Design a protein around this ligand. Structure first.
Ligand SMILES: [Mg+2]
Ligand SMILES: [Mg+2]
Ligand SMILES: [Mg+2]
Ligand SMILES: [Mg+2]
Ligand SMILES: [Mg+2]
Ligand SMILES: [Mg+2]
Ligand SMILES: [Mg+2]
Ligand SMILES: [Mg+2]
Ligand SMILES: [Mg+2]
Ligand SMILES: [Mg+2]
Ligand SMILES: [Mg+2]
Ligand SMILES: [Mg+2]
Ligand SMILES: [Mg+2]
Ligand SMILES: [Mg+2]
Ligand SMILES: [Mg+2]
Ligand SMILES: [Mg+2]
Ligand SMILES: [Mg+2]
Ligand SMILES: [Mg+2]
Ligand SMILES: [Mg+2]
Ligand SMILES: [Mg+2]
Ligand SMILES: [Mg+2]
Ligand SMILES: [Mg+2]
Ligand SMILES: [Mg+2]
Ligand SMILES: [Zn+2]
Lengths: 122, 119, 54, 114, 207
RNA sequence: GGCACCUCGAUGUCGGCUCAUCGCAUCCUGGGGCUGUAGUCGGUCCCAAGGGUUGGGCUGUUCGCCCAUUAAAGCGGUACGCGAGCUGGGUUCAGAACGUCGUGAGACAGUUCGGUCCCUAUCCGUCGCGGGCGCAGGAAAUUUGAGAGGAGCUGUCCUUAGUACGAGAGGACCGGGAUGGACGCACCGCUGGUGUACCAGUUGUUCUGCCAAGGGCAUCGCUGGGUAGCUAUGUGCGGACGGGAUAAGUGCUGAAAGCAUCUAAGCAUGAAGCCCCCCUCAAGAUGAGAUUUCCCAUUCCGCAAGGAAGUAAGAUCCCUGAAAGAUGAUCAGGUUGAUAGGUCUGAGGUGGAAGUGUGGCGACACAUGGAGCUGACAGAUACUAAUCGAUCGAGGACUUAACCAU
């Protein structure tokens, strides 16, 4: 249940450490966005280097959430942190690596370039 | 479920723990209707605890029966009377140790009254 | 709120067509003969269902 | 509670060992990608075992690359090939929810063998 | 078309052959019995009557006894009428067993919702509340009644009152498995009504 | 803005909230004509009111600017809708200060800080739920449907096809298939919430004479779980395929007017609009309908009409309750009977009882033993209560007509 004003943490070495949510992309309602959705987001905290600055409106996808994600046969998966990856408005990531586990409802979308950069997929 | 009887979660337990030993020592009391319909399911469970005769059963029933004197001359008690007498008496009964009989209404507040007695 | 107009007699006693009593359910106690009310112990004779209650 | 019981008894799986909350085990899940049948091994502590009947489930928690991943299954699903049992732990609970916090803090909190 | 009458018993689960969980509602039945035929030369339509769940002879009166004693059977407790159907494969006294629904079909389920009592507006009509702080004295109340100019309230407002207990029809459900022996019908999803209640399972109207 | 007809023995004014409804001079979706329209996008005009029409930052704000989305972020009426529905930030009471004016008391269509919001619903209206009588004998069930309400929305992607069109750049109509957003209905098997007579640990202090074992109070003392019911954030489903007439448009034949012309005769086609199809209520539809089944050979008065009394089918009083419920009502039952309680046997919840023994100096640990305990879940068993009884409830009016027989 990612919604407006949430503070997620960035799951790669782009140059941002936390990010805030500005809008969920979808129809005219769209209060909530679960695993595998795109969000407009502003960089709150950043590292001194990196290719992303402080206070920037970037696109982002969502990889992990505390809220679970139900699967086909009635099995569930959950984490203990919300995490995101910075999209380049093209499905390629704006970084080089990924940090931690990545969900599995990504591969069922066009996010092959991201699931191919992860340590493992659960 | 069960009835709340206008009282609170502790006043209710106190009232029922009183009425239980009242009915035990007396073998018949008289109260309102609903307050006697909620008692023939708390008395029969204690008679079933008494028909066991164990020590665990005795310690389970002592945590529910207050300390009055049943037989003043023999210095008996509600717990000992329960076990000995009401285990010897209702020995081959399977449920249904009580019965309710309805009187008319009360006078002060027109409430319905009743009588409850060990069968 | 406050009554705009007073209430006539006709409405006042049309309203009270449902405000009355009901004769109870009484039967004959077949031990003494006086009238008790059904399913209750006879407070005149002291018995119910044949057997007695001292 | 009986008529339902039998029609669901038709589909009960009866080869897995018994286990309580708080003991490491290994699940062999038959994850599928569309053309092949891989097998992923996912081991961890059994945070919770809940429900009864054919609707009985259970939860397994592990810590993969820093963050902890919980994952629940229906006990009788056919996407599980087998269930090993690594060890047995000594716990006083039936629902281990204090483990969701005692991961970091530079202190390791694990169970004891019994 | 076709249809039968049964009793809701409660929800459960089953795994398909793919190995995936499916919510399932169980519905028992028995051999229903055709008690009467309504042809177009006697009435204005075409319809058969169905009986279900016979009851013991002490609970039946003489009208009902005589009515159900023309098909040579026992007094049935639930009587209904299935209207849109072909009326040549049905005779009085004949039975209608559960074995007419194959697996994977599509049906409708008619049943009486379960009662909720006297409910307010926030729960009955799914309205919104006022604030709970900032000095307000407004929450859980049905709102303005309308404009001043009509000098009256428009027919069609939404106020408290008794909720539930109506008749509801769910559409485009699907049969999972038909146990011919025990007279059972596993339907996917959930159906209206409290446990141990009458449920009408007809064929699909949309097609 | 003008006027001053109504209200001074009192109607209180702006924004926001809850709830809305109407108009069309249409923001989107639907159908078309012209184009300085090659295609994708546009312009302007015509038909169309069924549905839809956002989250924030600044300001008391209407207004307004900006950020990010969206198919679109319409314009207006309803006392600039709605204070016996809410608020009181802003409007004009009494305190205080700043600027300016006044000799002064003081004033400002200047600014700033603070500042009591009353009411038990009589009648109409709106939403639910019952008694009475009617419907030409008295009851029980199944129904038709005059008529009334509900729903009415859309995106992206793959194919057709990098084909038509186009130097190239770029790039389709029409038709097929998946999968989403907001909205509505139902439900608790999954994920969670609550669960104050369920299970466990623990602090202080009083009580059961004492130790062990427990009870009372301290927000349910606090803390960890949690059955049934009730629930959404959870799950399933829905707005499908069509038919009949139409609007603007496109027409085919065809004269008035030897030609031309959509029309005057005649024959078509054509929209998210209209009437059906889909869902719910419905014979107090006083126009009170239809179908199937039960009860009927009484007794008194009354020349007669009629009245009265016992009853039949059936119903109610009274009692045990919940899939029901403010109270009635409804539903399941009342001894040839499982309606409730109790007892057994289970499901689920908690999680290893008391006693004893062994090890330890002691706090404690291990065994007997998935132990003990268990509210609202399921099944068996008449052990307890649904005793005996009473009240209500028919005898079927006239007048014509058609066909058969004399
Ligand atoms: Mg809101
Ligand atoms: Mg008027
Ligand atoms: Mg004047
Ligand atoms: Mg004048
Ligand atoms: Mg006037
Ligand atoms: Mg006045
Ligand atoms: Mg127009
Ligand atoms: Mg801010
Ligand atoms: Mg106004
Ligand atoms: Mg005006
Ligand atoms: Mg008003
Ligand atoms: Mg002053
Ligand atoms: Mg000065
Ligand atoms: Mg001066
Ligand atoms: Mg102020
Ligand atoms: Mg009021
Ligand atoms: Mg449950
Ligand atoms: Mg002491
Ligand atoms: Mg002690
Ligand atoms: Mg005290
Ligand atoms: Mg207390
Ligand atoms: Mg607690
Ligand atoms: Mg029950
Ligand atoms: Zn008597």
């Amino acid at each position: 249940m990612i919604q407006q004003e949430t503070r997620l943490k960035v799951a790669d070495n782009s140059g941002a450490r936390e990010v805030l949510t500005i809008k969920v992309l979808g129809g005219s309602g769209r209060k909530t966005a679960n695993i595998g959705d795109v969000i407009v987001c502003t960089v709150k905290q950043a590292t001194p280097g990196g290719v992303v600055k402080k206070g920037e409106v970037v696109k982002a996808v969502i990889v992990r959430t505390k809220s679970g994600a139900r699967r086909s046969d009635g099995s569930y998966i959950s984490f203990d942190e919300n995490a995101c990856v910075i999209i380049r408005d093209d499905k390629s990531p704006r970084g080089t690596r990924i940090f931690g586990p990545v969900a599995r409802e990504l591969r069922e979308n066009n996010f092959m370039k991201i699931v191919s950069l992860a340590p493992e997929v659960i | 479920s069960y009835r709340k009887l206008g009282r609170t979660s502790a006043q209710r337990k106190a009232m029922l723990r009183d009425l239980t030993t009242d009915l035990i020592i007396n073998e018949r009391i008289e109260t309102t209707e609903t307050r006697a319909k909620e008692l023939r399911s708390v008395v029969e469970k204690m008679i079933t605890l008494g028909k066991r005769g164990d020590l665990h059963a005795r310690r389970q029933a002592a945590a529910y029966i207050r300390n009055e004197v049943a037989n003043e001359e023999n210095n008996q008690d509600a717990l000992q009377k329960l076990f000995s007498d009401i285990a010897t008496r209702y020995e081959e009964r399977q449920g249904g140790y009580t019965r309710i009989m309805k009187l008319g209404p009360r006078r002060g507040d027109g409430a319905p009254m009743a009588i409850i007695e060990l069968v | 709120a406050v009554p705009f107009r007073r209430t006539s007699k006709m409405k006042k006693r049309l309203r009270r067509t449902h405000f009355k009593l009901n004769v109870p359910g009484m039967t004959e106690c077949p031990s003494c003969g006086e009238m008790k009310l059904s399913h209750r112990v006879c407070k005149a004779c002291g018995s119910y269902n044949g057997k007695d209650i001292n | 509670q009986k008529l339902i019981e039998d029609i669901t008894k038709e589909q009960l799986r009866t080869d897995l060992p018994a286990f309580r909350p708080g003991d490491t085990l290994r699940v062999h899940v038959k994850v599928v990608e569309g053309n092949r049948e891989r097998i992923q091994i996912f081991e961890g502590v059994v945070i919770k075992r809940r429900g009864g009947g054919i609707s009985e489930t259970f939860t397994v928690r592990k810590i993969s690359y820093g963050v902890g991943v919980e994952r629940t299954f229906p006990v009788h699903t056919p996407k599980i090939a087998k269930i090993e049992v690594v060890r047995y732990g000594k716990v006083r609970r039936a629902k281990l929810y204090y483990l969701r916090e005692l991961r970091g803090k530079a202190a390791r909190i694990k169970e004891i063998r019994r | 078309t076709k249809g039968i009458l049964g009793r809701k018993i409660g929800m459960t689960q089953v795994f398909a052959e793919n190995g995936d969980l499916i919510p399932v509602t169980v519905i028992e039945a028995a051999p229903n019995v055709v008690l009467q035929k309504k042809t177009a030369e006697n009435d204005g339509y075409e319809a058969i009557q169905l009986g279900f769940d016979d009851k013991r002879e002490k609970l039946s009166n003489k009208p009902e006894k005589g009515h159900v004693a023309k098909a040579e059977t026992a007094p049935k407790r639930f009587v209904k009428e299935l209207r849109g159907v072909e009326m040549d494969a049905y005779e009085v006294g004949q039975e209608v067993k559960v074995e007419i629904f194959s697996a994977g079909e599509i049906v409708d389920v008619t049943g009486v919702s379960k009662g909720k009592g006297f409910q307010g507006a926030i729960k009955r009509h799914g309205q919104s509340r006022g604030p709970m702080s900032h000095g307000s004295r407004y929450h859980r109340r049905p709102g303005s009644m309308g404009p001043v100019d009509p000098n009256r309230v428009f027919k069609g407002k939404l106020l408290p009152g008794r909720m539930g207990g109506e008749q509801i029809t769910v559409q485009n459900l699907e049969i999972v498995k038909v146990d011919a022996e025990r007279n059972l019908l596993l339907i996917k999803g959930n159906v209206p009504g409290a446990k141990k209640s009458l449920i009408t399972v007809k064929s699909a109207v949309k097609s």
